[PDB]
Amino acid sequence: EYKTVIPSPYVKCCGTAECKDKSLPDYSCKVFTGVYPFMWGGAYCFCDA
Amino acid sequence: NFNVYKATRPYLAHCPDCGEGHSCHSPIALERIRNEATDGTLKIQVSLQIGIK
Amino acid sequence: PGQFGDIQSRTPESKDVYANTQLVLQRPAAGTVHVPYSQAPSGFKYWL
Amino acid sequence: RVPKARNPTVTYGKNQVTMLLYPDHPTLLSYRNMGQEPNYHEEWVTHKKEVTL
Amino acid sequence: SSSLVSESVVSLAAGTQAVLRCQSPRMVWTQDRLHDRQRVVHWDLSGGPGSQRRRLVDMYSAGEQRVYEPRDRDRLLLSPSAFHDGNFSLLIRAVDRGDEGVYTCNLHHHYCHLDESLAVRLEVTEDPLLSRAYWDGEKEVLVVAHGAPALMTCINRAHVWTDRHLEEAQQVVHWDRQLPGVSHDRADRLLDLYASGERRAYGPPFLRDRVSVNTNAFARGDFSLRIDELERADEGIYSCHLHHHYCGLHERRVFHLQVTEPAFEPPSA
Amino acid sequence: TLTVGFTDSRKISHTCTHPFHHEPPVIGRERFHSRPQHGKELPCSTYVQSTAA
Amino acid sequence: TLTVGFTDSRKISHTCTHPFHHEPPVIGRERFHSRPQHGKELPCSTYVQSTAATAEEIEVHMPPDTPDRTLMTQQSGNVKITVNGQTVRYKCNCGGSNEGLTTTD
Ligand SMILES: *[C@@H]1O[C@H](CO)[C@@H](O)[C@H](O)[C@H]1NC(C)=O
């Protein structure tokens, strides 16, 4: 049986994140723009887009 | 005496149903569930912790 | 992917391993912090 | 809300496809042409089947 | 009867893309009904300007009060059904000398993000004949004999705080256009933005192709319209209307869109 | 079925039943069971908690 | 599908559910229900209740930030920052210290 290790997502608020090329099996990285994440008290990031 | 929880808290999360259909932020949002034991024992990673006061 | 042998190791304690499990990440939903992913289910667990 | 579904695996061939498909609950499948006839078919599926088209 | 938020005139050049700004942190909401009906009561204790405030007790809507001091448990009590009639009064079973100071009753609604508070100063005497309740001009002051109970009244019977349907379901943002020379009320509906996410556009294809709002508009509380390839039919008086009929929020922003002044424009207000 | 029930002031559990073939309909083309996290958005019809009808 | 529930000390019950297709794997050659008093003995895999377990590890590290808007009231056109005995970072775009991290009011 395999195990899908997914760590905590890197939310870069007011900036653009960059993927680092590692040597891991089925290593997958993707930067999604325009995220507006919500926590208990509203948006976690100060910037809107 | 099994004091392996010196740096712990409950780690509240966002469950897709708190009851009543729609989703909520719950203390018991289960994050991982493994069932590879062939005798049907479900092993559930729950967001909170037990036992330690 | 999705077939018997998607993950192969040489010995029960081999630290390196070969894997072809077809991980494809999708764009997360509006205002929710989570990592949605699409995955071919375990070839071993369904194979049985 | 409604679920999405797991994108399936595809194997190819000369003038044909073979689609290996993975469900989790009873799900639907449909296929058609784009010509003067639709030549329509559809199918309920429940287990890890592969189909040829 | 809608309150104005802010008024501006916007002049931009023909051939450019218009951005009609409409932003509000108080219109933020998401598709889910995640604890929308959540209010909180909390009583705070202070002792003048040169001491640090301490939260004493809090309580969620439809829930039970939480006390922070183990001695004060079963001693500081709110009515468990406080939220049904808006009777948020606090009954303290027995007062002592250490309880002297100003107590503030705070109501907060997390959906409208409203907070309302009033203060009452409690002073504990030893003689019962000095005990009185008076209004000093801006807050109630309660003089209480030692060991007697004190009912500090905090009553706010506004519809947002009482236990009633309390489900919105229909906040709507309207984008309106008042054409040059054309009077108001017979204005063409341009955009309807429903809290559920649905938008409704009206008019011929020449108008519908150019009017859009970002898909997370109400999620971020930013309803700015981006209109590509500005035509003369876009000039006019635009109005963004946020309507929360339940919370009594009815606000609009009005925009006089003129086409002139490419880089020389004075941004009004 | 459908069974309603309550307990008396004089500690008597009243329970009234009725036949009612309850099958909530599908939405889209996937016979699912509960709301997942990831999923599309399709229009359905619900009730509300209001009384002023 | 699966559900966990518990009731607070403020006596509020909470149920988080999850769509999961629990299906028992078959053992042997009889799709039985509950094991009888008279059985044949077949090996199988279960969980044991060992507390101090070796080599199954999770990474414990620091939390992210805790945003909240309820801790801000209007002190006659001002922003009062109640902290409730913690550390909070504020941010805006008006006059004064438009960003910064305070510790008390
Ligand atoms: C508020 O509740 C208390 C009991 O908790 C009661 O004594 C009091 O009369 C109530 N207030 C009013 C205005 O009835």
Smallest CA–CA distance, residue A14 to chain G, in Å, is 13
Q: What is the resolution of this structure in A?
A: 4.1
Mutate which of A1, A2, A27 to disrupt the C interface (most C C-beta within 10 Å)?
A: A2
A5 vs G: CB within 8 A: no
Report in angstroms the alpha-carbon separations of C43 from A27, A28, C14, D7, E110.
19, 20, 20, 15, 47
Bridge-partner residues for B26, per DSSP?
B13
| Residue ranges around ligand 1 (CB below 6 Å) | E 79, 87, 89, 91
Residue E78 Cα: closest atom of ligand 1: 5
CA of E87 to the centre of ligand 1 (A): 7
Of B26, C14, E110, E138, the residue nearest G71 (C-alpha): E110
Could you tell me whether strands E140-145 and E114-125 are parallel, antiparallel, or unpaired per DSSP bridges?
A: parallel
Q: Is-contact E121 E141, C-beta < 8 A? A: yes
Report in angstroms the alpha-carbon separations of E68 from E42, E74, E75, E100.
12, 12, 12, 18
Smallest CA–CA distance, residue A37 to chain E, in Å, is 10
**Resolved by:** cryo-EM
Q: Is-contact E40 E105, C-beta < 8 A? A: no
Q: Is-contact B16 G18, C-beta < 8 A? A: yes
For chain E, the straight-line distance linking the first and the last C-alpha, in angstroms and rounded, comes to 23
Task: Give the full edge-to-edge strand order of the sheet including E101-109.
Answer: E66-67, E54-60, E39-46, E101-109, E114-125, E140-145, E133-135
Q: What's the 3-state SS for chain A? A: CCCCCCCCCCCCCCCCCCCCCCCCCCCCCCCCCCCCCEECCEECCCCCC
User: Is E222 in Cβ contact with A48 (below 8 Å)?
Assistant: yes
> 3-class DSSP state for residue E208?
helix
**CA–CA distance, A35 with A13 (Å, rounded to integer):** 9
Q: Is-contact E219 E28, C-beta < 8 A? A: yes
Instruction: Find chains touching chain G: ≥3 CB pairs under 8 Å.
Output: A, B, D, E, F
DSSP state of D46: -
Residue E87 Cα: closest atom of ligand 1: 1
DSSP letters, F16-53, are: EEE-----PPPSSSB---S--SS---------------
User: Is A49 in Cβ contact with E220 (below 8 Å)?
Assistant: yes
- For residue C30, the chain E residues in CB contact (below 8 A) are 30-31, 215-216, 219
Residue type (1 letter), E107: L
Q: Going by C-beta distance under 8 Å and a sequence separation of 6 or more, which residues neighbour residue B14?
A: B23, B24, B25, B26, B29, C32, C33, C34
**CA–CA distance, B3 with B1 (Å, rounded to integer):** 6
If interface means Cβ-Cβ distance under 8 Å, which residues of chain C face chain D? Answer: 1-3, 22, 24, 26, 38-41, 46
Smallest CA–CA distance, residue B30 to chain F, in Å, is 12
User: Residue F2: phi, psi to the nearest 5?
Assistant: -150, 125
Breaks (C-N over 2.5 A) in chain F follow: none
**CA–CA distance, E72 with E68 (Å, rounded to integer):** 8
Q: Kindly state the tokens that stand for C4.
A: 């018997």
D9 → closest Cβ in C1, C26, C46: C1
Report in angstroms the alpha-carbon separations of E24 from A38, E31, E74, E190, G94.
16, 17, 43, 20, 16
Residue E91 Cα: closest atom of ligand 1: 5
Report in angstroms the alpha-carbon separations of G99 from A39, A43, E29, E64.
20, 17, 25, 37
Residue nearest to atom 13 of ligand 1 (CA): E87
Of B20, B17, B8, the residue nearest B52 (C-alpha): B8
Chain centre to alpha carbon of residue D15: 17
Report in angstroms the alpha-carbon separations of C20 from A26, A27, C2, C8, D47.
7, 11, 9, 9, 21
User: Is F41 in Cβ contact with E165 (below 8 Å)?
Assistant: no
**CA–CA distance, G35 with C48 (Å, rounded to integer):** 22
Strand intervals (E) in chain B: 13-15, 24-26, 32-34, 43-45
Q: Is-contact E236 E250, C-beta < 8 A? A: no
Breaks (C-N over 2.5 A) in chain B follow: none
